[PDB]
Structure formats: structure tokens, C-alpha cells
Design a protein around this ligand. Sequence first.
Ligand SMILES: [Mg+2]
Ligand SMILES: [Mg+2]
Ligand SMILES: [Mg+2]
Ligand SMILES: [Mg+2]
Ligand SMILES: [Mg+2]
Ligand SMILES: [Mg+2]
Ligand SMILES: [Mg+2]
Ligand SMILES: [Mg+2]
Ligand SMILES: [Mg+2]
Ligand SMILES: [Mg+2]
Ligand SMILES: [Mg+2]
Ligand SMILES: [Mg+2]
Ligand SMILES: [Mg+2]
Ligand SMILES: [Mg+2]
Ligand SMILES: [Mg+2]
Ligand SMILES: [Mg+2]
Ligand SMILES: [Mg+2]
Ligand SMILES: [Mg+2]
Ligand SMILES: [Mg+2]
Ligand SMILES: [Mg+2]
Ligand SMILES: [Mg+2]
Ligand SMILES: [Mg+2]
Ligand SMILES: [Mg+2]
Ligand SMILES: [Mg+2]
Ligand SMILES: [Mg+2]
Ligand SMILES: [Mg+2]
Ligand SMILES: [Mg+2]
Ligand SMILES: [Mg+2]
Ligand SMILES: [Mg+2]
Ligand SMILES: [Mg+2]
Ligand SMILES: [Mg+2]
Ligand SMILES: [Mg+2]
Ligand SMILES: [Mg+2]
Ligand SMILES: [Mg+2]
Ligand SMILES: [Mg+2]
Ligand SMILES: [Mg+2]
Ligand SMILES: [Mg+2]
Ligand SMILES: [Mg+2]
Ligand SMILES: [Mg+2]
Ligand SMILES: [Mg+2]
Ligand SMILES: [Mg+2]
Ligand SMILES: [Mg+2]
Ligand SMILES: [Mg+2]
Ligand SMILES: [Zn+2]
Lengths: 161, 119, 146, 132, 62
Amino acid sequence: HATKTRGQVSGGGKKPWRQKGTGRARQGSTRAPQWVGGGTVHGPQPRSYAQRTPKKMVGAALRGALSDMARDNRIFVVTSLVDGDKPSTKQAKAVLSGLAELRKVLVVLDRSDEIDWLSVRNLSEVHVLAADQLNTYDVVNARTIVFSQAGLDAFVGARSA
Amino acid sequence: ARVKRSVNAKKKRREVLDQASGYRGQRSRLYRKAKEQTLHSATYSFRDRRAKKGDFRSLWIQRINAASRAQGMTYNRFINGLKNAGVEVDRKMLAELAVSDINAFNSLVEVAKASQPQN
Amino acid sequence: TTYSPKAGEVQRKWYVIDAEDIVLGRLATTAANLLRGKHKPQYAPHIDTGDFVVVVNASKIALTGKKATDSLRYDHSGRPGGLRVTSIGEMLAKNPRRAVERAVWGMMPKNKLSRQQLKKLKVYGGPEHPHAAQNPQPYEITQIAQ
Amino acid sequence: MSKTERPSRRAALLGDRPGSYAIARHVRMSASKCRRVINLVRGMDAVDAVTMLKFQPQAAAEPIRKVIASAMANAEQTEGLRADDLYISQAFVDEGITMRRIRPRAKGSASRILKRSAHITVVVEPKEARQA
Amino acid sequence: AVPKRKMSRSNTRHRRSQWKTVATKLVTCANPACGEKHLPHTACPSCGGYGPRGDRRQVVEA
RNA sequence: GGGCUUAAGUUAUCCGCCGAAGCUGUGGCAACCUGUGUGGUUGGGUAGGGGAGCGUCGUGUCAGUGGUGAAGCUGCCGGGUGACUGUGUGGUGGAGUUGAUGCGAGUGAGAAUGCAGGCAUGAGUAGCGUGUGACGGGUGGGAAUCCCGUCCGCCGAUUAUC
RNA sequence: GUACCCCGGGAGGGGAGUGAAAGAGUUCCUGAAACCGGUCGCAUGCAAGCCGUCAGAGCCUGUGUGGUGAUGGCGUGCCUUUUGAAGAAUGAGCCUGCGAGUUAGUGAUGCGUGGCGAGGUUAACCCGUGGUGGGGGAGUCGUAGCGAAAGCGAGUCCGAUA
Ligand SMILES: [Mg+2]
Ligand SMILES: [Mg+2]
Ligand SMILES: [Mg+2]
Ligand SMILES: [Mg+2]
Ligand SMILES: [Mg+2]
Ligand SMILES: [Mg+2]
Ligand SMILES: [Mg+2]
Ligand SMILES: [Mg+2]
Ligand SMILES: [Mg+2]
Ligand SMILES: [Mg+2]
Ligand SMILES: [Mg+2]
Ligand SMILES: [Mg+2]
Ligand SMILES: [Mg+2]
Ligand SMILES: [Mg+2]
Ligand SMILES: [Mg+2]
Ligand SMILES: [Mg+2]
Ligand SMILES: [Mg+2]
Ligand SMILES: [Mg+2]
Ligand SMILES: [Mg+2]
Ligand SMILES: [Mg+2]
Ligand SMILES: [Mg+2]
Ligand SMILES: [Mg+2]
Ligand SMILES: [Mg+2]
Ligand SMILES: [Mg+2]
Ligand SMILES: [Mg+2]
Ligand SMILES: [Mg+2]
Ligand SMILES: [Mg+2]
Ligand SMILES: [Mg+2]
Ligand SMILES: [Mg+2]
Ligand SMILES: [Mg+2]
Ligand SMILES: [Mg+2]
Ligand SMILES: [Mg+2]
Ligand SMILES: [Mg+2]
Ligand SMILES: [Mg+2]
Ligand SMILES: [Mg+2]
Ligand SMILES: [Mg+2]
Ligand SMILES: [Mg+2]
Ligand SMILES: [Mg+2]
Ligand SMILES: [Mg+2]
Ligand SMILES: [Mg+2]
Ligand SMILES: [Mg+2]
Ligand SMILES: [Mg+2]
Ligand SMILES: [Mg+2]
Ligand SMILES: [Zn+2]
């Protein structure tokens, strides 16, 4: 997001009229902020909103978010969804058998778990993640998480005491 | 997130133009001129809500003075007589009695006359 | 709610005062009180509740000291050198009604209602007044003890 | 919420009463100068009004006379009324579009000139409605 | 001189209301065959005649 | 100021009353202190410091809602200690938007001889830029101001011609 | 994109048609305020008005509350700047819109809050073409001070191992 200041608005180089004698207010440029078509004083400028949250804080928040619905019994683990070739009908079933429809799926296998990924990709009430990208926002937004066996194993292996 | 001022701005203007809905000239048509009079109106109303006590007490005292002087007794002697007799009927009820129940007011005048120090 | 008179609710009476040997100040205070109706328990500043006052023998109003020739009355026409001055004795001799009206008006509030009420004062320098039809009752200037 | 009995000029000016009306929009004359003659013509009988406006010296008489004649014709056609028993029940002039122009003046200045315009409305009803 | 202050609505209207005109009076043409309205002491624009019922004289060829 | 010495003047003295948003009575609100059943003290306020909020726009989430009519605009009837507001009830209108809780601001205007537009005031006022036009007829819905004609006037080292 | 008819020279309007809607008729969505008017209610031609406020009759209305307001009291605008302004000091004709405390730094220094805690924390960059996640401890602050420094060290420096 960006705006043009009085220095960036086109024109406005010269004094509009003499300082005295005209009976008009003293003006310095036609692009002064109080003019129609003039520059914006404190309008937005491009920026980044990223915050340097500590690693321990980010990880712990993730642990607490996962733990709340672990205690609430909202994590299921499946060996996999779908067999052979890949449909969305199959996994829709596997998950509806699990429970409800505000879902998170973990399949971790970042390179070749196309079967499960592309099956659950189009549900629109399922969010699919790799185990190395769980993140607190998605965990909190999820009403339940279903891990693939490999997904849970890889998350545990990536972070364990 | 550019914000346009009009929707929020008009609220106080409508309030003030409603508050100034009997004024003469610009004071009931123009928000800026109505705003100046509403400040004066609020100051006058606050001042007059406290001066009203004195105004009505003065009216009651004048009516009591007239009613008691009709009985040959000044207001000060009448009030001192009531105070000595121990009748704590106030300026207000006394004025209402004077206007409405003149016989009861005259009986109170007799009470004050009897309760006078006579000195 | 305090009582308030309603237009013609209070009935206005007619009094007559013989200004024979009565000081101008006392006469004017009494006239102002009667005209404004301050002796009535129904008094209200905003509604005329007073009575009509007919003053007779205004030419025989008593004055103390050297007022009859040293107490001056001034009028100005509103133009340069437009002052006239006459002593209260001369004014009582010539136009007593003007003198009594000036005194009463000075003692009466400065109001549109006061201007209206001052018309209720009928001043005559002689002992006779033409308002027998209105049947004015005699009024005696008195004082209440203590 | 929009629906039925939608507002109309006839409903606002007559409201189920007999009579008619006529509007001349964008009359190329000033509203005040039109009002100067509207004030005279309001409340008169329609035939008397048009005959008088044939003789009224002001330039506003002509458009107002034509409006009154048009209202009379509208009444005669849409309510069977006759021209000789109509009277001008209402008559007013509102302001229309104004054009800003420039008149050059001394010392290089330019003075604003306003070419104003008016809308004229006349409402005619049978004379029996005068005492109603 | 220049107007010191903007005149109030009451005063502006008090002065403006006096800018008006009187209605033209009109008189019925004495000619029975015309019966139209014309200005007093003026030839009838319709019949183009002038004078009383009896001694009528043509004035305007219209 | 009226008027006043027949004090409504001065003075000593006595008895009453009037008189403030002061004090007291009664009802509501608030800050602080205190042992925490009580109570006490306090609450004019510019520069300025501290604290807690209203409204607008965007937005995460949840709950929604909308042609059986959103936004906006505009009445009425109400509400709050304030900014303000109703989950009251109409009208206009025609496609969005409410509540909870967070997040982000081009977040609030009466002033800057502020900027843009619209419109008043003066005012139906001043002016309409050197002057000579008259009349008959015509045209036309409409003619002092167009056309034709006749009188008359004006320029003519230029009001001509190139 | 208004056939046809009527008044009109037209412009414009009145009927009628089209359309869910024409008071969506091309100046066309919504249509606010200044500003200009018609109608109705009340007041107003003896009155000295920072235009209000408190008291208050009458009339109208009663959609039993609202509109108006005779008359009485009290009452010298807003802002700026000032010892002090209703000021005959400044600015503002009016409405609508716009118009001024912002943002960036692994800046400086407090506070609130959260994490970890004798430790805290990464920067560049690498991986995640899948992001907001993981790696990266190079550095940096804390961990001992005192001295110009060599240096010494819970001491050090001036001093004479004072
Ligand atoms: Mg430049
Ligand atoms: Mg410059
Ligand atoms: Mg620009
Ligand atoms: Mg008294
Ligand atoms: Mg609505
Ligand atoms: Mg030039
Ligand atoms: Mg005048
Ligand atoms: Mg008090
Ligand atoms: Mg107190
Ligand atoms: Mg108390
Ligand atoms: Mg305070
Ligand atoms: Mg205090
Ligand atoms: Mg402050
Ligand atoms: Mg629905
Ligand atoms: Mg919106
Ligand atoms: Mg919200
Ligand atoms: Mg802003
Ligand atoms: Mg504004
Ligand atoms: Mg100027
Ligand atoms: Mg402008
Ligand atoms: Mg004007
Ligand atoms: Mg004139
Ligand atoms: Mg003039
Ligand atoms: Mg003139
Ligand atoms: Mg002239
Ligand atoms: Mg000329
Ligand atoms: Mg000419
Ligand atoms: Mg010729
Ligand atoms: Mg010549
Ligand atoms: Mg020659
Ligand atoms: Mg529909
Ligand atoms: Mg509409
Ligand atoms: Mg328009
Ligand atoms: Mg529109
Ligand atoms: Mg009168
Ligand atoms: Mg005075
Ligand atoms: Mg000074
Ligand atoms: Mg000034
Ligand atoms: Mg002044
Ligand atoms: Mg100065
Ligand atoms: Mg100025
Ligand atoms: Mg301005
Ligand atoms: Mg290191
Ligand atoms: Zn004729």
C-alpha cells in the first residue's frame, strides 16, 4: 500500500501566486496537502509486518495448541487415506467416519505423498499440511487433526526430547 | 484502509440541529451557528435550574407577604411567629395555602400572632 | 406546581386616592404597589393582576424641604439644545398628571407590562374625577406595625 | 420499503380531488421574475387569468399564460371540466438549472453572471372546490 | 461603501416583498358583437374599435 | 434611578427578616483511604500528566443475517454518566451486512486571509461600452431592435475603396 | 430510449404505452446539506431583542404529546492570542467533501505484558516453490570491577607494599 506525498505528486513546483497583495492565503505549492489533488501527509507506505517472535515462544505455542485438543481427544491417526489411485470421495468418507467437517490433515511426505495430498486438497473444509509446517494458526483453527502414520512419526522425529 | 468521514461526522450535526430546532435565523439552520447557541443554551439552562430555587422562593415570599399583610402582619413577623410556634410549614406550602385556603392561612396568621414575643 | 393566574382569572378593582397633603413619594409607592397588585396573594409578575388607581387632588400633593422649587424635572427632545427643565412645584401647578405619572413610572419596573399597567393610573389635579361609573372605592395609605 | 401508492405529482397536488395541473420545466427566465406574476395570478379564475396575462406587461406573463392554458386543456380532457368553471387552485415557481457565464470588467477582472431558469406549476380545480 | 454584514433573512424578505406589480385591470368591450376585455381608454385588440355602444369608431384594422 | 427630611440621611442600640452553586435536608453518580459489618475524606479548572471509553473503515475466527428488502438517507417513539444509541416503529432505497472477540488504521474538523464544488448576501441594485432616428408595408406563434420602401440624419484625408 | 392522442411555435407537461420499478425518461442508481418556494397551525404593526434560557397565559392539536408563544426574570457571540477580549485585536459569508503527531531502524531509553532464565537471543543466509515453519549462535547483551595504561582483581586506583 502506498500514497504519493507532496513531493511525489506531479507538478506543484512553483509558488501559485505572490506571497502578498492578492488577498489570498499564502500558498507554496498547488500540491500542498490541504489542496485538492495534493499530496497525502501520513498515508500508508509499503512495509513488512513480520514479527521476530522467539523460537521458544513459537514452538511452545504450537505445543500448547496441539495439547489442548490432545486433551480434548481431537487427534486421530490413520495409516493413510485412499488406496491405489486417488479420489476425493474416498477420503471424504474416511474423514466423515473420523468425525465432523472442520479438519486438518498431516501427511508430511513432502515430495511424493501425492495420493493423500491430492485426495484431501479439494475438500474446502480440510486443511492439509506437511508435518514440518504444523504452525499454531492452523492448529488452533482446526477442530480436529488427523495425522497419517508417517505424518505423526515425522513430526515426532523432527521434534522430540 | 482509507476512511470516509461523512457517516460518522453527520451524527453530532444531526444532534445539534435537533437541539436547536426552535431558534431564529441561522441558529436553527446552520450547524456551526447552532453549535454556538447550544453552548449558551446549556450554560443558561444550568444557571437557571439553580436560580429557579431562588425565583420560586421569592414568589412564595411575596405571596405570603401579601396574604399576611392582608391580616395586618408583615412577612418577617409572620415567619418569626411561625418559627417560635414551632410550625415548620415551608415557603411553598404557605404560598399555596395563601392562594387556595385563605382561611387556613389566616388561622396560621393567628397562630403566629399568638406566638409573637409581644415585646 | 406553584399557582399561576390565568389571564382574566384575577378580578381587577378600582381604588381612588385623595392626594390631599400626601407626600409624593408615599403616593407614588402606594400607586405602584396597587397598579402591580403586590397586595394580592394572587400576584404574578408576568400577568397583570393589579388594580386601577384614580388619584384626585394631585395639585395639592405635599412636598418637604425646598423641593417645590429646587427638585427639577428634565425632558429632552433628542436634538442639540433640546432640554427643557421645570420644577416639580410648577409641574404640579400646571400638569399634575404628568408629575404623578413620572413618579409612578420611575418607581415601577421597566417593562412592556409596566407600560401597559401605567395606563391604569388616572390622575386628576382637582377634587373630582369622571369615573363614577367605575365606582372607585376610597383607599387610605396606612402602615402595618412592626 | 418501495411498494404501491407510489408518489406522484397529481397525488401530491390534488389527491383524488377533481382538476388537473401543468408544469413548465426549464423556463429560460428567473424564478423571482416569474414569481412576480405568479403571485398576482394565484387564486384567480382560469379564463380571467389568461385574458389578464395577455395584457400583463411583464415578460413572465407569456410562459405562465401558456402553462395555465395547458393545465386548463388537461383538465378539460381528463376530467370533462369546462374552461369557464376552473380556478387556479395552486401556482408556484421553483428554481431550475443555472448557467455560470463570465462578463469581462475593468482591469482584467471577470465578473460572474448567473443565467437562471424556473419551473412553473399551476393547479386548476372546479370553482366549487373554492369553498371546500 | 460595502455591505458590512450579510443581511438577515427577515430583513432581506421585508425589502424583497415590496418588489411586486399590480394586476392589469381590463374592461369589457362596449361592442356587443365583441364583448372582449381591453385596456381602459384603449382600442379593443379584438374588434379594433373604440367608443360607447352607440358611437363606436374603428381604430385598429385588426 | 424613582423619589426621600412627615427619612427612605447620619449615629448609638434593640427586635425580626431577605439574601449564594456556602451550610443543612433528601435522591443519584464518582475518586481515594481504611479496618474491610462500618465509615471517613474528596470530585472548579487553562498549559499539562495519568486512567478508562464512544463512533467510523478494513480484517482473522465463530454465530449468523439479507429482494418476506442490506447499505445509505429521512421521520417518529424511546435509552445511557459522556462520546453516542435501540435487538422500537415507519418512509425512501435496491445489494449487502450484523453480534461476539481479537488484529490493523489514510479513524473523528468549525476555524489554517486553508483547498474543490454548490449556493446565499448586497439586489432585481450598478451597468448594458461616443451617437438619430421616423414611418409605411412585409414576414412571423412572437417584431422598437429581421426584410423592403419612403422621409430624415451621420461620415467623407474617411464611418469610403484596395 | 416513451407508438398514438391533447395544450404548445417550440421547450415542457397531460393521457397512454414499455418495464418489477419511469418520482429508473437519457441533466436518467442512491439523491444528504446549504439555498429557493407552495400549503397549513400559532405568533407578530407601543416595540430597544449575542436572539437564548427559566417562569408562563392563550390558541392549535390531541396522533391527549406535540406545535406556537403574549408576558416576567436572568443573560455582552465562536476561535486565536493575551496581564486582561462581547470586544471597535485576529480568522471565519454559507453548506457538503477534503485538510496536520505518521512510518522506517535485530537505533537510544522507560513502562506494561509474554517467553526463557545464569543465561537470553540470532543476523546474513540455507531448506520449506508448501506460508506464517525448521535450521543458522557469526555475533551480541548479562556473567567483576578498578586504572591513562602495563596490570591487578572483590577489590582496584592516588600513595610510601602507608
Ligand atoms: Mg516538486
Ligand atoms: Mg517553497
Ligand atoms: Mg493525486
Ligand atoms: Mg416586595
Ligand atoms: Mg431500514
Ligand atoms: Mg485588457
Ligand atoms: Mg429595517
Ligand atoms: Mg441554595
Ligand atoms: Mg455544596
Ligand atoms: Mg447535602
Ligand atoms: Mg475533576
Ligand atoms: Mg468543589
Ligand atoms: Mg489539559
Ligand atoms: Mg435467506
Ligand atoms: Mg460498508
Ligand atoms: Mg469487529
Ligand atoms: Mg484524517
Ligand atoms: Mg465541514
Ligand atoms: Mg477576503
Ligand atoms: Mg470556494
Ligand atoms: Mg441574490
Ligand atoms: Mg427599480
Ligand atoms: Mg442599494
Ligand atoms: Mg438605484
Ligand atoms: Mg441604472
Ligand atoms: Mg450607444
Ligand atoms: Mg440601437
Ligand atoms: Mg432601411
Ligand atoms: Mg454630414
Ligand atoms: Mg478636401
Ligand atoms: Mg420484485
Ligand atoms: Mg423514488
Ligand atoms: Mg442532477
Ligand atoms: Mg437520481
Ligand atoms: Mg400590540
Ligand atoms: Mg434599556
Ligand atoms: Mg496587549
Ligand atoms: Mg471581532
Ligand atoms: Mg463588533
Ligand atoms: Mg494581531
Ligand atoms: Mg474577515
Ligand atoms: Mg473554511
Ligand atoms: Mg561466539
Ligand atoms: Zn371589442
